[PDB]
Design a binder for this molecule. Sequence first.
Ligand code: NI
Ligand code: NI
Lengths: 347, 326, 326
Amino acid sequence: KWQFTPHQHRGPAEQFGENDHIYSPKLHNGSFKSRGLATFMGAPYCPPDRHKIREMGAKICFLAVPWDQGQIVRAGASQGAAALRDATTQYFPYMFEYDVDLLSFFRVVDCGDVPTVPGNNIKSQEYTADYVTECLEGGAKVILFGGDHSLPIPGAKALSRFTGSGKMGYLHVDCHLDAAPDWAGNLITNCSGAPRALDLPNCNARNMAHMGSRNGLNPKDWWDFYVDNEIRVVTMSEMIERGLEVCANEIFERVKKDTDSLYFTWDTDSIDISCMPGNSAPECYGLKGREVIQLARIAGRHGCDILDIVEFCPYFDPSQIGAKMTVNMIYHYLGSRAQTLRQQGKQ
Amino acid sequence: SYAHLFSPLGLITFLRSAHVPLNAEALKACGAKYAFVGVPFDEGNIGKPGSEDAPREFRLITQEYFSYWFEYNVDLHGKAVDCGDVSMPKVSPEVAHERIYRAVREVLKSGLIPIICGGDRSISITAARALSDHIGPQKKMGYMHFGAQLDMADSWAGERNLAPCAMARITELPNLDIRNVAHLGARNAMNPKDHIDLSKERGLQYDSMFDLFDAGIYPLVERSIDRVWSGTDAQYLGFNFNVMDSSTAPGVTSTEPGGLESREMMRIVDMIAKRGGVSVIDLTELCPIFDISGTAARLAACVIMRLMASLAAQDGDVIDDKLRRT
Amino acid sequence: SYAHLFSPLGLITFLRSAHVPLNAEALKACGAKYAFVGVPFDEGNIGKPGSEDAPREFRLITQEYFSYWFEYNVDLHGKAVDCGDVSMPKVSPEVAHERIYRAVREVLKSGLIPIICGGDRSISITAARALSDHIGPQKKMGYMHFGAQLDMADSWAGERNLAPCAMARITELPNLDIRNVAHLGARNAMNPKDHIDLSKERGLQYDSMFDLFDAGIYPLVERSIDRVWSGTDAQYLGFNFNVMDSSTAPGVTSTEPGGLESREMMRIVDMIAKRGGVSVIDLTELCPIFDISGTAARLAACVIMRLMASLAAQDGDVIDDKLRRT
Ligand code: NI
Ligand code: NI
C-alpha cells in the first residue's frame, strides 16, 4: 500500500533495497537527469481520501492546489507545482544536515493536485477545502503548494473545521499584508487571507501574526486591519534590525500559545527578487537565501499543521533557482521537524 | 478624497503622475515637488547599448505601485509630475547636450527637483553643469554618486564628454569643491590606472566598495553624506545601479559582482533623506534589454520612490493615520 | 607598451590572451604564469546538460574586462595564455580522460599553473591525478574544493569515474593525505548518506555551509587553508560555483540556495592568495543554458581574475606607481 521504487525505474534494472532511496543509485541514474514519472520526493502516490491515507499510515501529504484564478494580479502560479515536483528529482529524500530520511520518517505521500473549475473561485475553493479535509481526516499533516495566495482561505477553513472546539493559530509570511476587507467587493481573493482567517470562529487575533512586509504595494486598509485588531506585524525592517531568529521564535511562540493547531502560509514574494524572480509580483528588500532556509528550519522546530507555499511562477524564471528554493523551503521544514521530534522522543 | 490610498470599492508617466510641459511657470503652478525628465540619450556610451530605452521601461515599472508607503505613512500622490522626454536630435552630441542643459535649467527655475532618467552616464556632466550655473559662483554645490566605475578619464578615445569622462568633467566645475564630492562603489577592473592617478591628483576621496565593506558601510557613507550636504546650498545625487550586486541589478550597462545588496541601499536612502533635501536626482545606465523580470528597473524604482517617501516623512508631510476606508 | 593600463587613445581567448600551443617548451618560453585549458567534456554529468558550452561562454565574459585591477595595483596582461580546448572524442570517456591527463601533465611540465574550465566535475579526477603523478611519491600534495555537493559516491550507477564520485577518487591519491584535503560549502539534499559515511570512514573534514555560518565563515576557511597549504609541496584548488547562493550563481549544473555571496567568496580568494601559490586552478559545472544575464559566468570570471590578481599582489608583482598615460 505505501510503496515506491527507489530511484523510480521499474523493469529489468529495478532496485528493491528498502533504503536505496537515500543512497547513490546502484543500477542506473534514477531521475537525476531525466524526470520520467516523478512524484514529489519520489513518494508513493496516494489519492486524497481519508481511508487510503490512513491505511498507508501517511503522516505528511503533499497536495498541490494550482488554482491561480483567485488573483488580482496575474496568472502563472498554476505552473508552479510541476516545476516543484521536477526539482525534487535533483535531490535525495535524505538530509545530512538533520540526519533524516524525510520520506520514511514521515511516510510522505504525493496526493496529486486539487481540481479546478476555471472562472469559478467559489467552487474551486470549496474543492480545495474538501481535499485538505480528506488529508487531515486521514491523520496526516499537510504541505500545500499553490497556486494563488487565495489558498489560505480554503486551507484555514479546512484546518479550522478539523480543529473543532480547539483553537487555531495563523501565521502569514509575505511581502504584502494581504488584509483587504474586500477587493472591489470580493471577499475571497489572494489579498484577503488574514481577515478571512480572523473571521473563523476558533482563530483569534492574539494567535495571528504577519512577517516580511516592506515597500509600497500595501494599501492603508491592509495596515489598518493589523493596527485595529492588535495583530503582531514584524516588518522586513524589524527582521533585519533584531535578527531573523529572534523575530521568528517570538512570533512562533505567539501563534502557538494555547493553540491546538497552526496554519502557516508562506508567500514566495517574501523572498528577495534576486533569489526568486519567478513570482507573481516580485519585490526587492526581502529574505536572502540563507535566511529562507533558516526560517524554514525555525518553523520546523516549532511545527505547523498546514504549511502552504504560494505564488511561485516558473514561467518568469530562466533557471532552476525558483523551483529549487521552494524544494528547500519544504525539505528544511521537514528535516528540522523530524530532528526536533526525534530529540523529544516522539513521532 | 483619499480613495486611492485604500482597496477599491467597486499616458506612460512616472508613477501615473500628471503631465506638465517642460516650462518653468507651468511647473511652479502645478503643485508638485519633483519633475521627471526622461533623457533617452545613448551616445556617450562606449559599452553595451540599451540605456536609451530605460526611461520608458523605468516609467512602466513605476506604474505598478500604490502611492501609499505604510512604512513612512506617506502618500506620493501629487508629489511628482512627468515632463516627458528631452527631444534628442540626430547624431549631434554637442546640440544634444545643449538641449539637456536647457531642460535642466528650466526645471530648476521652477523650484522643483528634476529626476533625470538616462540614458548614458555622460548626461550627468551637463545636468551637473546646469545645477552649477543655476546656483552661480556665490553658492556652493555638493555631488554624490553611486557606481562601480570612477569615470575619471581626462579623455577617452580622444574625446572629453563621454560617459567614462563624466567625473573628470564634473569635478572641474568652479563652485564644486572636491571636499563636497563623494563617489561610492568603485570595484573591479573597469577602472584603468589613470582614473586613479587623476583622482589622487585632484584629491577625490572615493569610497571603494571594499573600503565600505571594511568600515561596515554605513559609518563611511555617513561621513561622505556629511561632506556633501554640510556647508553646501545645493546637492546633486546620481545613481549608476552597477553599484548593486549583479544578482540585484542585472539590467545595467556594466553589471559587477561584489556590490551592495538591496537592504543596504534602502538604509543608505534613509540616511540621505535625514538631511531633508536634494537639488537634483539622476539615474543612468539602466539597460533593460538584458533583464527578464526587470529586476534592475524594479530596484531603481524602489530606491527613488523610497527616497521620495523618506524625504517627505522627514519633512513631516505624512497622511492622517486615523483615516479609515469606511 | 602600457596603453592597456590606461583609457584608450583612439580567436576568442581567456582575457584576450595569446594562444600558445599545448607544448611544455612553448609554454616554458611564452613568459606567462597561467595556461587556460578548455575541457568541453560532458559525459561524467549525471544531471542536467549544458556544461559543454561553459569554456566558450566563460572566455567571452573575460574579454570585456581590462587587465589592470586598481584594488591590487596589478596588471594581468601576459600573465596568462590560452592553449585552446583539449581535443577529445565523444562516446569514449576513457580516451577523453587520458587526453585530459596528458594535457594537464604537459602544462605542469612547463612550470605554468593550468587553469582548467569544464565541463563536468569529473574532469577534476584526471586533473588531480596529473598533479599527483607530476610531483611524484616523494612529495606531498594538498586539495581544496568549493561546492554544495560532497561528491563522495564510491560508485554511482555501478560506475567509478562520474562527477558524484569525484572526491571519492581524489582522496585515494597516494600522495594526498586526508589531512591536507578541504571541502567547503556542502549543503542541501544532493548529498546521499553513503557520501556522509564514506567521508566519516576516511576522515574527510568537510566544512558544511552550516559549519561555515556558525563560524562566521572566514575563521573556518582560514583553518582549512592552513591544512591544505601547510607542509605540502603542491596545492590543487577547484571550484563548483554552486558553492555560491543560487542568486549569484543560477547558471550552474545544480544550483543551490543558501550559499556564499559574491563578496564573501572575494574575501576568501584574498585569504587563499596570502599563501603565495597554487599549482592547479579548476572550475567546473558552469551551465550557461540556466544563467540569468551571465550572472554566474561573470561571478566565476571575477573570482578567477581576482585570485590571479591577488596572488600577483602577494608576490609584489605590482605596477610601478609612477607611470602615467600618454
Ligand atoms: Ni500574498
Ligand atoms: Ni504577496
